[PDB]
Amino acid sequence: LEVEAKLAEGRKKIEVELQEALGSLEQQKEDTIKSLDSQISALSDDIVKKVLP
């Protein structure tokens, strides 16, 4: 019974341990993509200079 309670405790721990890091990563990648949108226009140019001589 008590190791079943510990088996249940593992699930209560995993929900927090995953979802908090997940929220951090979601908002981080969103900030990083909308931040780069001002710079990707300039970062496109080196590909042009690479493909055409």
Binding site: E2, V3, K6, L7, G10
Partner: protein, 61 residues
């Protein structure tokens, strides 16, 4: 008849006494062996109560 009969009752009463001492040894044997075996059954139980955290960590990685 008296020598064989006194021999029979004497040997049988000494059987009472020596198997009574042996009974004392077996009573002590059972008490001491329960004192030992409690520890080993608690050992396998605590093996489980640790292995639950062990598999918790194994899936934590």
């Amino acid at each position: 008849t008296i020598r064989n009969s006194e021999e029979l009752r004497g040997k049988a009463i000494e059987q009472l006494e020596k198997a009574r001492a042996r009974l004392k040894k077996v009573e002590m044997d059972a008490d001491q062996f329960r004192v030992n075996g409690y520890s080993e059954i608690e050992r396998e139980k605590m093996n489980l109560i640790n292995s639950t955290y062990k598999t918790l960590e194994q899936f934590e990685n």
